[PDB]
Scaffold this active site. Structure first.
Site, mmCIF file in Angstrom:
data_model
loop_
_atom_site.group_PDB
_atom_site.id
_atom_site.type_symbol
_atom_site.label_atom_id
_atom_site.label_comp_id
_atom_site.label_asym_id
_atom_site.label_seq_id
_atom_site.Cartn_x
_atom_site.Cartn_y
_atom_site.Cartn_z
ATOM 1 N N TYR A 109 1.053 -1.406 0.089
ATOM 2 C CA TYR A 109 -0.037 -0.106 0.134
ATOM 3 C C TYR A 109 0.870 1.325 -0.014
ATOM 4 O O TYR A 109 2.005 1.118 0.391
ATOM 5 C CB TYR A 109 -1.159 -0.052 1.135
ATOM 6 C CG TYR A 109 -0.122 0.208 2.592
ATOM 7 C CD1 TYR A 109 0.131 1.298 3.122
ATOM 8 C CD2 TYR A 109 -0.157 -1.058 3.195
ATOM 9 C CE1 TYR A 109 0.495 1.454 4.519
ATOM 10 C CE2 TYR A 109 0.651 -0.891 4.703
ATOM 11 C CZ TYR A 109 0.969 0.297 5.092
ATOM 12 O OH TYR A 109 1.751 0.448 6.397
ATOM 13 N N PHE A 139 -5.361 5.798 -0.803
ATOM 14 C CA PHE A 139 -4.412 4.794 -0.550
ATOM 15 C C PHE A 139 -4.317 3.989 -1.985
ATOM 16 O O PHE A 139 -5.509 3.530 -2.494
ATOM 17 C CB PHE A 139 -4.899 3.815 0.474
ATOM 18 C CG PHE A 139 -4.666 3.880 1.974
ATOM 19 C CD1 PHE A 139 -3.677 3.536 2.405
ATOM 20 C CD2 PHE A 139 -5.383 4.830 2.568
ATOM 21 C CE1 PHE A 139 -2.887 3.807 3.564
ATOM 22 C CE2 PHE A 139 -4.938 5.046 3.949
ATOM 23 C CZ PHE A 139 -3.900 4.723 4.568
ATOM 24 N N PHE A 161 2.137 9.757 3.507
ATOM 25 C CA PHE A 161 2.609 9.446 4.855
ATOM 26 C C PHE A 161 3.163 7.947 5.171
ATOM 27 O O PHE A 161 4.410 7.866 5.475
ATOM 28 C CB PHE A 161 1.235 9.606 5.654
ATOM 29 C CG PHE A 161 0.081 9.096 5.601
ATOM 30 C CD1 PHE A 161 -0.263 7.907 6.133
ATOM 31 C CD2 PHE A 161 -0.927 9.703 4.617
ATOM 32 C CE1 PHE A 161 -1.502 7.406 5.638
ATOM 33 C CE2 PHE A 161 -2.168 8.978 4.301
ATOM 34 C CZ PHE A 161 -2.321 7.871 4.829
ATOM 35 N N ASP A 162 2.262 6.908 4.988
ATOM 36 C CA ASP A 162 2.885 5.556 5.063
ATOM 37 C C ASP A 162 2.774 4.547 3.918
ATOM 38 O O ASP A 162 1.851 4.484 3.307
ATOM 39 C CB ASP A 162 2.117 5.006 6.348
ATOM 40 C CG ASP A 162 2.951 3.747 6.908
ATOM 41 O OD1 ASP A 162 4.055 3.640 6.974
ATOM 42 O OD2 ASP A 162 2.165 2.966 7.193
ATOM 43 N N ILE A 192 -7.842 -0.099 10.203
ATOM 44 C CA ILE A 192 -8.611 1.211 10.146
ATOM 45 C C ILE A 192 -10.156 0.652 9.298
ATOM 46 O O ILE A 192 -9.749 -0.254 8.701
ATOM 47 C CB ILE A 192 -8.202 2.499 9.351
ATOM 48 C CG1 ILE A 192 -7.751 2.109 8.205
ATOM 49 C CG2 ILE A 192 -7.006 2.997 10.363
ATOM 50 C CD1 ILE A 192 -7.108 3.277 7.138
ATOM 51 N N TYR A 197 -8.850 7.993 10.956
ATOM 52 C CA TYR A 197 -8.644 8.465 12.287
ATOM 53 C C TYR A 197 -9.886 9.666 12.857
ATOM 54 O O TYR A 197 -9.920 9.850 13.667
ATOM 55 C CB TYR A 197 -7.161 9.127 12.123
ATOM 56 C CG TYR A 197 -6.314 8.025 11.551
ATOM 57 C CD1 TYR A 197 -6.007 6.955 12.470
ATOM 58 C CD2 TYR A 197 -5.661 8.086 10.545
ATOM 59 C CE1 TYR A 197 -5.148 5.918 12.051
ATOM 60 C CE2 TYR A 197 -4.519 7.160 10.209
ATOM 61 C CZ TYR A 197 -4.340 6.079 10.954
ATOM 62 O OH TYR A 197 -3.845 5.084 10.782
#
Lengths: 202, 204
Positions: free
Chosen positions: A123, A194, A133-134, A151, A177
């Site tokens: 991902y 994503f 971000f990640d 999530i 979040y």
């Protein structure tokens, strides 16, 4: 003058402190005020401003910083609502009942995962402004993740995906979040984009 | 001079003010505003670091050991000065030295009730160091404070029980009956005798 090893540390103290305070929304930090302030303390000189004035100013800075953070998340919420509104009308994007929006890059007839399954996925998390971000692809390694331990946005999407499929996810803030942004890179009310590929079910 | 006009400026000033006092009680007397003020502009402008982070960390630890020994000496010096102050002040007329080493000078006498250890007391006070540097003044705050006898420092506990409602006294609390070598507040250094102008307004 950074010649003194004492001033080496002096510079670092101001350097670290400056960076720390800046992130707390204290953009309005003038080194001049702090400079003489330290000097007055160093020479046992009188306080140009008594504790009473200092106490009031500190609270003002705190409230101003708090309200700046409130506006940031509130503006982000409106920005993310807008992105999803326009992206949902786009052809090729399917909006689910939860509001999750997905666009199938590669399709497959592999099995569909269940909540009691672990899935190997690749991902790359991004933001509406595109700030990554990640990213499992940036880390270079596939990550095995459980469907029920992620999530809520991924939970729903993964079950819809078949093994081998690659989709683009547009998770609304509520299904991730939300206004709770313990994550620094992810501000409050931030829609998460994503790129997810279901490599396999472990 | 310095602006100190923006509410941001007023606040930034005291960050440095308290920082100087905090670091001075951390053994760091060598700090000069020359570079700490520079650092703020450099960091906020995202200007390149003037020193490699690696050399920065080494210097921090270098000064840490220097400041450690510096702290021990500053404390021992303050202790000897304080104990000498107590002895000399005890020789003065009107100063009653108690068994705990506490010295007291009754400014205003009274025949009010004596506070128990369980009572809460309304007190107007003015805490000052031997050099006259004030640390906590109910008078400078403008308002008396109701404080528990159990909560206060052992010097206050003993003194208040000897006092009477309405009585005003001067306190000379030795470091042992106060904070001592531990300095929880930057305003109060290690091994520091406390001087207090206290009036017992009443008992709650």
């Amino acid at each position: 003058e950074l010649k003194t090893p004492a001033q080496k540390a002096s510079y670092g103290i101001g350097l670290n402190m400056g960076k720390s305070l800046s992130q707390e929304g204290m953009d309005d930090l003038d080194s001049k005020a702090v400079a003489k302030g330290i000097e007055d303390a160093l020479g046992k000189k009188k306080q140009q401003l008594t504790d009473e004035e200092l106490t009031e100013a500190f609270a003002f800075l705190q409230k101003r910083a708090e309200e700046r953070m409130a506006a940031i998340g509130d503006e982000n919420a409106k920005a993310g609502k807008k992105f999803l509104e326009e992206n949902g009308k786009r052809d090729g994007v399917t909006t689910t009942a939860s509001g999750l929006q997905y666009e199938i890059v590669k399709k497959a007839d592999g099995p569909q995962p269940k909540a009691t399954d672990v899935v190997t996925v690749h991902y790359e998390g991004r933001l509406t402004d595109g700030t990554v971000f990640d990213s499992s692809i940036e880390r270079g390694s596939p990550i095995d993740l459980p469907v029920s331990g992620v999530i809520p946005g991924w939970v729903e999407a993964l079950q819809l995906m078949h093994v081998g499929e690659k989709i683009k996810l547009y998770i609304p803030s509520e299904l991730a979040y939300g206004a709770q942004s313990p994550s620094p890179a992810i501000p409050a009310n931030s829609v998460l984009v994503f790129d997810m590929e279901l490599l396999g079910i472990k």
